Design a protein around this ligand. Structure first.
Ligand SMILES: Nc1nc2c(ncn2[C@@H]2O[C@H](COP(=O)(O)OP(=O)(O)NP(=O)(O)O)[C@@H](O)[C@H]2O)c(=O)[nH]1
Ligand SMILES: Fc1ccc(Nc2c3c(nc4cc(Cl)ccc24)CCCC3)cc1Cl
Ligand SMILES: [Mg+2]
Lengths: 468, 167, 166
């Protein structure tokens, strides 16, 4: 086993003890440790664990400032070399070249791996957590200086690479696998954006364009928007703008479905509206757009809609089944949803809400530190749990949809604003009052209402067509 | 087997709401939690001699999904309406939550408890007398809890189960 | 779902990272940023069974050669990559194969031989030559292009199949 530098000159050579590191019961899993021990293991000479690097860089800000992390890994990088051994000394005294076997081994098996692993932390930091640098220009200057002044031929390739990567990041294409299917059109024809509406667009293309939109919104959410539960705090609009844009789209679509339903006063037309929405749900299911699925389910289980028994009665039983199966995904704390998500073939759009709740509860329900033998140790297992969730999120963010964007339909749904200028409570009260109007409480009898749609209500269905 | 009660926790986000259910389900002697595992929201308890099973829905963190509230609330027989005692807005939100619950359940008499939660050592801004008066005006119990010490947590949930039993 | 630890190895610049990122993101990386060690996950259905792939993307630069043992121990299966326009990278294969056998102390390690950059016309390693080597190892040979996606899924999912029947 290699001898190490003295702990007095190089802090990262302190022996492991339960006063500075605790392992969970082929590499160890760390339960807790001092920052020094966490950084030693982040850059350990014996083995690689790139997943540890992602976990650490995702979560470290709750126990170490970015400026301090950089100081610590620079300190880790600067490893003292041992002096010549007795055999070396004797060789030198006789005018021979020393074997320097121990020095050479220490360079090969300790220094070069640890230094390369420090550089890999810098690389990952810059490539995947660049916001530390975006929000603190001086931190970036320190990183550029450090990398820019690493000497020695051994690190040279990566030092020059990381320098270029940083410069690229400062001023900052998909291949398939088959062509996307043809865009489908129904009553509204290409370019006629004025006529676009729930029933006039093709239900297939509604589901596709919403899936592209909802996939882009999903894929845009960064871990920085999630760690520390910042989307729930006062500055959520500052720290979690992509997450909140994604959620607000979901909310607006759900409210639009409810609005389309209760503002259709004629029972027959309203049945056609609900049936078309369930068709869109079916295509969401086919596309593994689980956010889209739950958007529809949420709308159908809302107070204004759920209570529309006369509408429900006339929905074809096969569509009742589709809706009920979709709803069962969410039952028992999303048991079937979770099993389904883990079984499908991506691309998909997960429901984000489950992740938010699990991240929040993980952070709230576990202590920042563990106290052991009079010492405070960072509770790293808490951070690993959070990073397992952000890691699962990122895993589903990789796969793109093979679907063609339709710019006008995309814009139509980007600009959807069912509440208009009304506040949430007053719009919500409005929807429920409309519900009461179109299907009064028992024992009030059901009134009749005139039709509002001047175009055919028959759906083109949800099976795709294909000309030559 | 035993009766299972479906309890739902509602209230403003960002003010320690989740501590209530965590403190209840948690192993009372190790500050730890994994919301990811089943049995993290189910709990067998004895209340007034009668053993029952608590199923708690707390979607803390999902508050911005406001159009999903009805669907989450629909699943519940009893409700904890939670506000933070150092956040007046969360207290002012209570009325809308209660109205929303009544509408979803289609009833003027839904089993519910009002819960004032102390989530940190910041200055209180909602007096207990204010919250008591509000609870009385609704005809429901008021329970104050601490998010750190587990004080009041059992009382909040057990009181709600009694409200369901006596409905 | 079963989890599979895949490791991508081979000389510097043969396209180990480009292959991996094409598989993960459907994106071709044009830059040449030498890897130290990168990890990726991919949920995918293969032969009707949902798999979770952990892919370790390794360093081909010789300066990192002392740190290979470390990842070879964890890997369940190996993509041994060379570039068909680079004879030296092909000659380097033999050393990766032997070190893997040595480290895992086994002659029966799931492996696929991969000849990358098959989109380029200027080939210097003939298919027959690589095929003969693969046969002597008892493993399949697949030609790939990280640029066009030709063979990429075949290479990775073939490796999954070998781990599965191991
Ligand atoms: N034409 C073509 N170029 C490719 C292909 N695969 C990789 N390249 C190019 O070859 C270079 C090296 O790619 P890279 O993936 O970084 O190789 P690597 O094996 O990961 N290198 P390292 O071992 O240092 O990490 C890049 O410029 C990349 O764009 C391919 O299939 N076709
Ligand atoms: F058009 C409709 C109008 C109202 C409803 N409401 C629902 C009802 C029931 N179950 C439901 C389940 C879901 Cl997921 C969603 C809604 C439902 C059974 C009790 C009567 C109503 C459903 C439809 Cl399709
Ligand atoms: Mg590489």
């Amino acid at each position: 086993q290699m001898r190490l530098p003295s702990a007095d000159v190089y802090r990262f050579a302190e022996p492991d003890s339960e006063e500075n590191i605790i392992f969970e019961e082929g590499i160890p899993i760390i339960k807790a440790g001092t920052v020094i021990k966490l950084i030693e293991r982040l850059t350990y000479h014996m083995y690689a664990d790139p997943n540890f690097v992602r976990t650490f860089l995702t979560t470290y800000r709750s126990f170490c400032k970015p400026q301090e992390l950089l100081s610590l890994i620079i300190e880790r990088f600067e490893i003292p070399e041992p002096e010549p051994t007795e055999a070396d000394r004797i060789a030198i005294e006789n005018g021979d070249q020393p074997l320097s076997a121990e020095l050479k081994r220490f360079r090969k098996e300790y220094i070069q791996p640890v230094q390369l692993r420090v550089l890999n932390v810098c690389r990952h930091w810059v490539e995947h957590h660049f916001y530390d640098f975006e929000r603190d220009a001086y931190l970036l200057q320190r990183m550029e200086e450090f990398i820019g002044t690493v000497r020695g031929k051994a690190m040279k390739k990566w030092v020059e690479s990381i320098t270029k990567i940083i410069q690229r990041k400062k001023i900052a294409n998909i291949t398939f696998q088959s062509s996307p299917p043809t865009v489908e059109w129904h009553i509204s024809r290409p370019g006629h954006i004025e006529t676009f509406d729930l029933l006039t667009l093709h239900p297939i293309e509604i589901a596709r364009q919403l899936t592209l939109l909802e996939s882009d919104l999903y894929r845009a959410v960064q871990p920085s928007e999630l760690v520390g539960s910042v989307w729930t705090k006062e500055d959520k609009e500052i720290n979690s703008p992509n997450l909140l844009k994604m959620i607000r789209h979901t909310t607006n679509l759900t409210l639009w479905f409810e609005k389309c339903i209760v503002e259709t006063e004629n029972l027959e037309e309203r049945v056609a509206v609900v049936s078309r929405i369930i068709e869109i749900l079916q295509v969401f299911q086919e596309l593994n757009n689980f956010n889209g699925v739950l958007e529809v389910v949420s709308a159908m289980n809302s107070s204004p809609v759920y209570r529309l028994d006369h509408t429900f009665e006339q929905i074809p039983s096969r569509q009742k089944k589709i809706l009920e199966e979709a709803h069962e995904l969410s039952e028992d704390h999303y048991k079937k949803y979770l099993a389904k998500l883990r079984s499908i073939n991506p691309p998909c759009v997960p429901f984000f809400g489950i992740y938010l709740t699990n991240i929040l509860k993980t952070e709230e329900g576990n202590p920042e530190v563990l106290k052991r033998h009079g010492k405070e140790l960072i509770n790293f297992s808490k951070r690993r749990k959070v990073a397992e969730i952000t890691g699962e999120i990122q895993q589903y963010q990789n796969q793109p949809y093979c679907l063609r964007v339709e710019s006008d339909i995309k814009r139509f749904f980007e600009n959807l604003n069912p509440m208009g200028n009304s506040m949430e409570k007053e719009f919500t009260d409005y929807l429920f009052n409309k519900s009461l109007e179109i299907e009064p409480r028992n024992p009030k009898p059901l009134p009749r209402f005139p039709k509002k749609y001047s175009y055919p209500l028959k759906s083109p269905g949800v099976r795709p067509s294909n000309p030559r | 087997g035993m009766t299972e009660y479906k309890l739902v926790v509602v209230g403003a986000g960002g003010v320690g709401k989740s501590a209530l259910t965590i403190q209840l389900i948690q192993n009372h002697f190790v500050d730890e939690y994994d919301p990811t595992i089943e049995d993290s929201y189910r709990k067998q308890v004895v209340i007034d001699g009668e053993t029952c099973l608590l199923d708690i829905l707390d979607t803390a963190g999902q508050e911005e999904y406001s159009a999903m509230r009805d669907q989450y609330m629909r699943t519940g027989e009893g409700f904890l309406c939670v506000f933070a005692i150092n956040n007046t807005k969360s207290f002012e939100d209570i009325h809308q939550y209660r109205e929303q619950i009544k509408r979803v359940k289609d009833s003027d008499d839904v089993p519910m408890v009002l819960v004032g939660n102390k989530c940190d050592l910041a200055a209180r801004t909602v007096e207990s007398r204010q919250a008591q008066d509000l609870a009385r005006s609704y005809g429901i119990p008021y329970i104050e809890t601490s998010a750190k010490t587990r004080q009041g947590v059992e009382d909040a949930f057990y009181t709600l189960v009694r409200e369901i039993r006596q409905h």
